[PDB]
Amino acid sequence: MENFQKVEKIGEGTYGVVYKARNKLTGEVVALKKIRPSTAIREISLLKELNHPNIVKLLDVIHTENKLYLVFEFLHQDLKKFMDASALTGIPLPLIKSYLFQLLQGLAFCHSHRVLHRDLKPQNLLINTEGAIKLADFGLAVTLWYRAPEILLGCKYYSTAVDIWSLGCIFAEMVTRRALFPGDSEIDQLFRIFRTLGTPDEVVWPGVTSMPDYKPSFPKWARQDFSKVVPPLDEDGRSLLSQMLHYDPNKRISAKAALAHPFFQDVTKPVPHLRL
Numbered sequence: 001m002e003n004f005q006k007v008e009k010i011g012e013g014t015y016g017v018v019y020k021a022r023n024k025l026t027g028e029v030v031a032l033k034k035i036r037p038s039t040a041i042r043e044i045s046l047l048k049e050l051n052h053p054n055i056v057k058l059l060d061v062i063h064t065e066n067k068l069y070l071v072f073e074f075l076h077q078d079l080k081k082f083m084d085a086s087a088l089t090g091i092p093l094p095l096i097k098s099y100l101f102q103l104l105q106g107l108a109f110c111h112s113h114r115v116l117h118r119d120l121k122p123q124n125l126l127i128n129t130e131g132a133i134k135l136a137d138f139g140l141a142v143t144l145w146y147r148a149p150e151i152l153l154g155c156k157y158y159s160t161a162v163d164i165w166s167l168g169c170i171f172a173e174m175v176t177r178r179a180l181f182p183g184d185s186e187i188d189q190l191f192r193i194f195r196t197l198g199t200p201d202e203v204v205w206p207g208v209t210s211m212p213d214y215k216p217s218f219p220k221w222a223r224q225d226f227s228k229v230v231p232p233l234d235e236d237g238r239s240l241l242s243q244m245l246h247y248d249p250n251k252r253i254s255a256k257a258a259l260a261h262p263f264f265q266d267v268t269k270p271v272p273h274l275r276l
């Protein structure tokens with residue numbers, strides 16, 4: 001817009017390109033989201049008031065000249081770049097455990113407001129030098145990787161639980177430095193989950209066979225041992241991970257319950273080792 005000097009493009013994806021920009025008035029740097037509807041305008045205002053230490057703050061909404069710009073606070077790194085820069089040693093467990101606990105606090109704040117992220121992933125998870133992690137790119141709702149099985153099976157009325165699955169997958173990625181379910185299409189994605197967690201059924205998931213895209217012809221696979229899936233996560237973590245990865249949306253753990261899981265009895269807030 002005619003108020004922001006665009007320093008550089010930092011993102012793209014579905015709704016729009018995002019930029020590092022400085023407000024010519026104040027001087028402050030921010031993230032400008034160029035989108036691309038009364039309903040959308042009204043929903044966006046809901047988010048303006050949605051405020052929490054772990055949710056990336058939405059500063060201003062500029063619907064002008066029939067265009068939509070969203071102005072957010074800026075953070076220097078996303079989790080994806082940080083995980084890439086730590087591929088060799090991996091992220092320390094206390095750092096991981098701190099980030100999962102903050103991500104859970106945010107998701108627990110959003111959910112009690114009936115707001116879902118729906119597209120959680122490393123790239124829209126932002127971190128600062130002060131050891132804080134924040135949820136970005138939401139309230140708005142190309143990889144299939146962190147997509148919950150109910151969405152892949154045609155369910156239209158998603159639960160907050162789709163988020164918990166995505167987070168679960170992210171958790172397993174930080175620990176193993178390797179993506180859990182790196183499928184490259186809706187069906188390849190579905191078959192990888194089936195291969196690790198076994199093909200679901202009426203016992204493990206009552207109702208699954210009456211889902212839109214369920215096909216009786218799905219090959220039958222056995223569940224693998226979580227010990228082979230997420231080494232070296234201790235029993236407390238593997239426990240929490242399996243409750244976040246439950247096929248049934250209804251049996252999947254909520255962010256509030258996960259907050260009291262014994263895996264966070266010893267949480268702390270170490271500061272990352274980032275290079276900007």
Ligand SMILES: O=C(Nc1ccccn1)Nc1cccc2c1[C@H]1CCCN1C2=O
Pocket residue numbers: 010011012013018031033056072073074075076077078123124126136137
């Ligand atoms: O603050 C940000 N910094 C940053 C730096 C490098 C890479 C990504 N982000 N980013 C930021 C802030 C608010 C909203 C968004 C973003 C980016 C991340 C991906 C999609 N984007 C958004 O929708």
